[PDB]
């Protein structure tokens, strides 16, 4: 009875964590790719102004 | 960015100043040279009138 409830609850519990794990790692990778994009865009005109610093 | 835009504005403001000064100097130079050539013509006319007066003398 309640045993069956426990089995069902535990079995469904494992479902949510594992599926979310892949999404979490994909989010991390996409975040890092975008941050690298911005950093690459950041330093270029930064150095351009460094050259343009007082001409 | 932002400061680059400020540098761009400044590098054109002095350009405008230089262009304005150049226009003023060009106008002044042209006026002075025109006055000088008019005075040259005046001197030539005065020489001619001196010659004519010397002829009458």
UniProtKB/Swiss-Prot annotation, chain B:
Superkingdom of origin: Eukaryota
Entry-annotated residues carrying N-acetylmethionine: 1
Positions of region (Disordered): 13-38
Modified residues (Phosphoserine): 45
Compartment(s) where it occurs, according to its Swiss-Prot or TrEMBL record: Cytoplasm, Cytoskeleton
Record's note on what induces expression: Induced by hypoxia. This induction is reversed by exposure to normal levels of oxygen.
Function, in words: Binds to actin filaments in muscle and non-muscle cells. Plays a central role, in association with the troponin complex, in the calcium dependent regulation of vertebrate striated muscle contraction. Smooth muscle contraction is regulated by interaction with caldesmon. In non-muscle cells is implicated in stabilizing cytoskeleton actin filaments.
Domains: entry comment: The molecule is in a coiled coil structure that is formed by 2 polypeptide chains. The sequence exhibits a prominent seven-residues periodicity.
Family membership noted in the UniProt record: Belongs to the tropomyosin family.
Assembly: Homodimer. Heterodimer of an alpha (TPM1, TPM3 or TPM4) and a beta (TPM2) chain. Interacts with HRG (via the HRR domain); the interaction contributes to the antiangiogenic properties of the histidine/proline-rich region (HRR) of HRG. Interacts (via N-terminus) with LMOD2 (via N-terminus) and TMOD1 (via N-terminus).
Protein's name according to its UniProt entry: Tropomyosin alpha-1 chain
Organism: Sus scrofa
């Amino acid at each position: 009875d309640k045993l069956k409830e426990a089995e069902t609850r535990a079995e469904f519990a494992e479902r949510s964590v594992t599926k979310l794990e892949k999404s979490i790692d994909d989010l991390e990778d996409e975040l890092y790719a975008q941050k690298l994009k911005y950093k690459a865009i950041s330093e270029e005109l930064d150095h351009a102004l460094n050259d343009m610093t007082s001409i | 960015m932002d400061a680059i835009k400020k540098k761009m504005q400044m590098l054109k403001l002095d350009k405008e100043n230089a262009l304005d000064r150049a226009e003023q100097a060009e106008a002044d130079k042209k006026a002075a040279e025109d006055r000088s050539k008019r005075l040259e013509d005046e001197l030539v006319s005065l020489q001619k009138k001196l010659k004519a007066t010397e002829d009458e003398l």
